Amino acid sequence: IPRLSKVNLFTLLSLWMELFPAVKRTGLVVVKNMKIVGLHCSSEDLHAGQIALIKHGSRLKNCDLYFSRKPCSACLKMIVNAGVNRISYWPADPEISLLTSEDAKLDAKAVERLKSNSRAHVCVLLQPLVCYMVQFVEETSYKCDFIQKITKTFYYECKQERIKEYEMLFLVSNEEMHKQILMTIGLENLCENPYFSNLRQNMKDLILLLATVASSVPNFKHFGFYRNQSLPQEIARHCMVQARLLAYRTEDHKTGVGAVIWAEGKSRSCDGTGAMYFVGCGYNAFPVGSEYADFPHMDDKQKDREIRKFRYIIHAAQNALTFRCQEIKPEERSMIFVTKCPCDECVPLIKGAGIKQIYAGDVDVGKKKADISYMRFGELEGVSKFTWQLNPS
Amino acid sequence: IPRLSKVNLFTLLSLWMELFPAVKRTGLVVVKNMKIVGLHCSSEDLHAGQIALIKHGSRLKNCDLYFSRKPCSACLKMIVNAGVNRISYWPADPEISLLTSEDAKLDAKAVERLKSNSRAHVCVLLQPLVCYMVQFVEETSYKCDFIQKITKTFYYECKQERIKEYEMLFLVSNEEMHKQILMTIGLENLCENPYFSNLRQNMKDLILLLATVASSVPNFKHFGFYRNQSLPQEIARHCMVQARLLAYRTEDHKTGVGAVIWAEGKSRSCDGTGAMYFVGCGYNAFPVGSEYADFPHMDDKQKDREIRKFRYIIHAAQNALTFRCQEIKPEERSMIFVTKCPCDECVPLIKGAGIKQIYAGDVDVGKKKADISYMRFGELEGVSKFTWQLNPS
Amino acid sequence: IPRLSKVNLFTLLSLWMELFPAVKRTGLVVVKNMKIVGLHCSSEDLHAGQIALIKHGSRLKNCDLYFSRKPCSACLKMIVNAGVNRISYWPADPEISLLTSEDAKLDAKAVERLKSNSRAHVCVLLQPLVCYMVQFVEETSYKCDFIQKITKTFYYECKQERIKEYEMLFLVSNEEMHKQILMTIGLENLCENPYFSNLRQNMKDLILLLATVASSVPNFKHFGFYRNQSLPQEIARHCMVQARLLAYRTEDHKTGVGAVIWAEGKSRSCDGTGAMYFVGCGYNAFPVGSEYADFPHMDDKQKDREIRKFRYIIHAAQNALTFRCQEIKPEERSMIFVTKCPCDECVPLIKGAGIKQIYAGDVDVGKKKADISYMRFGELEGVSKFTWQLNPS
Amino acid sequence: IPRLSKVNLFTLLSLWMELFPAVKRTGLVVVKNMKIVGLHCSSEDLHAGQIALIKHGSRLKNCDLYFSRKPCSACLKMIVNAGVNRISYWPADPEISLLTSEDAKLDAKAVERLKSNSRAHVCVLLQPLVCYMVQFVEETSYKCDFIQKITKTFYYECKQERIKEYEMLFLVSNEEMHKQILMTIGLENLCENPYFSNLRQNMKDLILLLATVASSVPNFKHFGFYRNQSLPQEIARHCMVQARLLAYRTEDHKTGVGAVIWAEGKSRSCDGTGAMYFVGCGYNAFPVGSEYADFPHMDDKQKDREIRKFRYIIHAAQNALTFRCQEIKPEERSMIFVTKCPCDECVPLIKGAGIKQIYAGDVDVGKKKADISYMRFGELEGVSKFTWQLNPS
Ligand SMILES: Nc1ccn([C@H]2C[C@H](O)[C@@H](COP(=O)(O)OP(=O)(O)OP(=O)(O)O)O2)c(=O)n1
Ligand SMILES: Nc1ccn([C@H]2C[C@H](O)[C@@H](COP(=O)(O)OP(=O)(O)OP(=O)(O)O)O2)c(=O)n1
Ligand SMILES: Nc1ccn([C@H]2C[C@H](O)[C@@H](COP(=O)(O)OP(=O)(O)OP(=O)(O)O)O2)c(=O)n1
Ligand SMILES: Nc1ccn([C@H]2C[C@H](O)[C@@H](COP(=O)(O)OP(=O)(O)OP(=O)(O)O)O2)c(=O)n1
Ligand SMILES: [Zn+2]
Ligand SMILES: [Zn+2]
Ligand SMILES: [Zn+2]
Ligand SMILES: [Zn+2]
Ligand SMILES: [Zn+2]
Ligand SMILES: [Zn+2]
Ligand SMILES: [Zn+2]
Ligand SMILES: [Zn+2]
């Protein structure tokens, strides 16, 4: 199966964070040592870069920041002063809108000057997807737990709606306006063909993949996460889409599973996500630093259990707990969103970590295979469980 | 005086952690930069490795883990994924008991496959003790504050009882069964003599040392820690034995002192120690990085006070506070267990650190020497003091 | 404009910390990677070094400690055990007073022995000031916001009073007594001229600068910080003087701004500052790692706005929040002291960081320049504001 | 078998380097990353420290230097300027003889002052040997290739001669004289019992071991290395003793083999070894970073060839070539001294490395075991071979 790249994952996550349910809004992904340490969105008061500064301080040192729009000079100077390594940005209309004029152009010039005189590398890191990536994402999106649950109780029309909305929000349809933006933000190297058309096509492909993933957890009928107090359904869908986007980084050759751990702070926060802050993320993969041939990749179809992937595969929730950027606070409401039903090996870890709520798929609940089972999720006590289903009330 | 090795200290501490008062139970010592950063025991729900993962996350990177039993494949894959440097284990029956069959053998095979394809080094690191180590430990154990206090108000009989119990728990008396276990867990290099007999003798010697140290703080008559609410006497004895085992790492040539700082969390935890979590450890030694001849080692017998050890020796409590892996929470109950009465330059440090309770011996209480005194412990206010004594009730 | 050096800033800050409003009292500055991570004062129970040990633990590794007095052997051994890099001290009467005898001399000998056999470098790092530095500091202090506010509603007389008091507290007027102290504390290389006279003159110049800066925020008439509950006026003045001292590290060629963030803990603390602990510090400067010609240094007088400093200069509050050594706890009272009224791009950052109180001089409040404005401080909601002012009561 | 420690090996090698065939003469061992990178001796013009400076330059950074005598102030200042980590010295009469007066005392005072004000750690690092190290060394020395070859064609009498000579050269028999030396060189912590007597006994034990090893390759009955031009027999014996001392660092449990590679430069050199300079050293051991139980330690007595040490043991010559500090220059004469006959997997490596001459023992020449053979040494062409033997003329 095709694998989404780390940088394209971070770009997609930054654009999706710009869509977190609450000068243009900006989503930001803070990555350290190729691990996500922050998911932020611009609020009405502060930009994503300012919020990242407030949240991280000097911990932004040697960090990679992925912005859904090019940050303003005020954000860029603070981010550079904090000591980050790379600032990758989505080359649409920047944070200070160029489609609104002289002040925005002056801000762009100041951003260029800051970039030219800093050790931080400000760049556009989005790369083309493989030829089959979009088709594979669509195939797995129609077949995921949530779409299957709705079907057993529409997807392409919602996907078309998401395509239109996200192409409006993230793309510059007018080629001349996009060329003007790219010239203003110092991307003259991408203003002439075939680089201009290649960049626009790559942006369109990434927007298509994002729309596919977002519609894989659709706002359809009364379907939501139900069955101690549930989150607003929009935020639950957004976090599930985050985990679903992570599921495409899987090293498993058959099934991709993603997991995001979020927590709700007691007090007010400066972030655009409100009291909710990102805690951890993960996908199912073999232990860090493993080559392709290091561990068996076969499923139960292989006769010898010793050469099956199950004893060696790290699950999405296990990776999310392992590489968490925040501690699970017992007094806070903490939620883990998993695209697949947590297995009997992961549920005790979630319970022991103190995670209060699990938002999960429901397809594999009750399955009992030789090396993996799903019996402890149905009978789990002390942790609230929310599954994709029709609203009982 | 003979000095206990760091690796043997960690092995003994993992074996003792397996005995913390509440698939076989497993103790675990997490060490970072040759400093202990975690003491864990398997609970009824989670193994020691899973608990260490939950408690540390990616902070296990480049850490040394010391297991009382060889971890299972599920624990090993998560520990390796976290990036640990070195997993040492006690070569008795592993976590998945081989003395119960096919599932345990398959788990051992998966553990060996994980070891072969990972940068983490899975090994048996226990070393032979010096010829005089056990005799010296026995001599100092009979002469310690607690045994002397009981005598001033039995030790060898309790020593024999602990020897029998710990040889039952930690050793495989049958040589053929031990050979089978070693072959299963991939220790064929130690299955034939003299390496098999050397390994068994080293294990027996370490178990004898552990029984000696555990008997030095015996469950005898109604003796316990008494004089705001005291811990259960079993946990207090266990922590005092931890500090006593640390006391044998001393650089002082005459008296070894050990100290352990523990804290009781307000909320429930996943660990087998309950709400109690390890905060810090220390022993009396010269400042880190000092050579043998760097500082004077003499005592008050030396005429010149300028060439006495007192002004240059770091006390056990000072080292426990310095290299603590956790912050002292003001709202939490925090306990420091010291094998000797805290001195007048340590009591203010304990009080200022916020440690609520001091469990200690009381032989030197009131002693006033030129370079060390014990006057501030008797008159200490704001910190609960628990000494080894008969129950006043 | 002349710039205060980092080592002189830290020496001055340690001397000022010794004067924090409540064996001689000692101030201590803990610096890591040329950033201040701790401001401590000796309490009645514990010395500054012991308090730094309690507060930081192993985080003192590779840290530079700046003491207002030479630490005692008990403090020095624990500090070098913690692994610090440099211990700079003010070469006046040490912590164990030599002007009071045999015990102090023995402590000094033990300190020298600890210094000889440790990798930590114990030294005197104070360096001569720039020739114009004192005159420039006097000129800017007379023209600072607080002195000007008093004038619009004395400074040299208060400066003379501070000169006398601080020369009494920090200098040894008798040359032979100072020579005895220097010989005892192992500074024989500075006991003969011109090095002895040069050291005494450097100390006098630094004391003069400290008196000037402390008089810039005088205890005059009923002037204090007023406008949810304010701090004691002495502590507010002390923190404002800290910020004023930081303002002389500015990279801006016209105006120096300093900011200190402190927090009042809920529970008792071992520090001499009481429940208050240092959170962060900063001054107005260009992004870290910038050369002199990297960014424009001009002001609004320059015609082109693209070559003005404003879009590239990091403000004092921005730097204080960026390089904070502590997290802003929502339940704690947090105060930021800034020598100039916070600008319109700093007030939202202070509000979003959770800082409860802003202490500031408000000369520029209401000013609206092209690239910087002060409109949001006057209308700021949710943050208590205290300005230099006559007491309204 | 007992294992000589790294630091005691380096101390013994520095003492032996002082005896290299040609203010007291000083031998010096330069070690980097626990590997020997230099063997130097004082010449008539330059001291060992000055020669090390000339030879290494800034490569002395973070190096450990082992001196047979405490270096003078001129040597010490240059060595600490070069940035070394540790200077361990043998605590006999220092480089500037204290047994000759005021100038030597002034030099010692300057050395102490340099040590006190430098991050380099000047110390005495010699450790006590295990209680049976000397007996094992004597047993293996009587049974070595050279002594056995002498017997098949005395040892204890030569051993007594070496004991007397080396106790005269390296020890201070007069206890009061040694106390005076130790006080002068700032070792007052080792001037009173039991530390004084312990240090003297440790020095005596190390001298006894050195005499044993040196007599294991004795100057006896015109025996030497014979069979294109051989070295002077004294230098060949000295290098063979170097390799023999390295042979006691072996990880093999039965047979210890050592190897030293030296090269004769074409031009004049400042070293006391003349044109000869140290190239590399090694002993037979398992691959670097291996635990005791990592690899099989068994020999041909074990039935299964897969669990024998031979396929996993790195030979002495292989380690000497691997961790060489100098390149083998084709135009220079190169000599490898190995305490055992080179095996069939070592001779091709020596030939391919360009080593011109092999000085070796010859007891195993012609032996052909299953996993190790000695057939290629007898028929080796293009490399001169010198064996312990009667002089043919
Ligand atoms: N809570 C879980 C459960 C599973 N996984 C990952 C790791 C598992 O190796 C993979 C599932 O692999 P299977 O071969 O069992 O896949 P399916 O469940 O899709 O298989 P099937 O439908 O054939 O039963 O998903 C995960 O990350 N988190
Ligand atoms: N609270 C304490 C007290 C002491 N120590 C350590 C450091 C001291 O140097 C050592 C005790 O050394 P003494 O020479 O004082 O030994 P004793 O306690 O045995 O004294 P005495 O000979 O009077 O019985 O123990 C410690 O770590 N913590
Ligand atoms: N809250 C603030 C406000 C300003 N500054 C810094 C930014 C600039 O480096 C400098 C102010 O520059 P100006 O040119 O505005 O200086 P003045 O205040 O002296 O301006 P004016 O000439 O109008 O009096 O102070 C700061 O650090 N924090
Ligand atoms: N040129 C060589 C030859 C051998 N060795 C080392 C590694 C070998 O593992 C060890 C020899 O191991 P054996 O068991 O073969 O020892 P002996 O040769 O002494 O055995 P025996 O006398 O029983 O034949 O010496 C070495 O370093 N360099
Ligand atoms: Zn911005
Ligand atoms: Zn799972
Ligand atoms: Zn396990
Ligand atoms: Zn003490
Ligand atoms: Zn002190
Ligand atoms: Zn500002
Ligand atoms: Zn010299
Ligand atoms: Zn060989």
Residue numbers in the entry:
A (entry chain C), B (entry chain B), C (entry chain A), D (entry chain E): 30 to 51, 85 to 162, 167 to 219, 227 to 300, 311 to 476
Q: Could you pull the original sentences from the published paper?
A:
Vertebrates possess a second DCTD-like protein, CDADC1 (NYD-SP15). Unlike DCTD, CDADC1 contains two CMP/dCMP-like deaminase domains (IPR002125), connected by a long (>100 residues) linker within a single polypeptide chain, resulting in CDADC1 being approximately triple the length of DCTD (e.g. 514 residues in human CDADC1 versus 178 in human DCTD). The C-terminal deaminase domain (CTD) of CDADC1 contains a potentially active HAE motif, but its N-terminal domain (NTD) appears to be naturally inactivated due to the mutation of the proton shuttle glutamate (the HAG motif instead of HAE), suggesting noncatalytic function. In this work, we provide biochemical and structural evidence that human CDADC1 deaminates dCTP and CTP.
In the presence of dCTP, each CDADC1 protomer contains a well-defined dCTP in the active site, therefore one CDADC1 hexamer binds six dCTP molecules. Within the active site, the cytosine base of dCTP stacks under Zn2+ coordinating H398. In the absence of E400, dCTP N4 displaces the Zn2+ bound water molecule of the ligand-free structures and participates in the Zn2+ coordination, mimicking the transition state. Astonishingly, five lysine residues that constitute the positively charged patch on the CDADC1 surface all rearrange to form salt bridges with dCTP phosphates. The incorporation of dCTP into the active site triggers a cascade of structural changes on an increasing scale. The loop region between these two threonines undergoes reorganization to avoid the collision between K393 and K377 bound to dCTP and H336. All the above leads to the stabilization of a large unstructured region (residues 376–390). Most importantly, the two antiparallel protomers that are too far from each other to form contacts in the absence of substrate, directly interact in the presence of dCTP. Upon dCTP binding, the combined interface area in CDADC1 hexamer increases to ~1,130 Å2 per protomer.
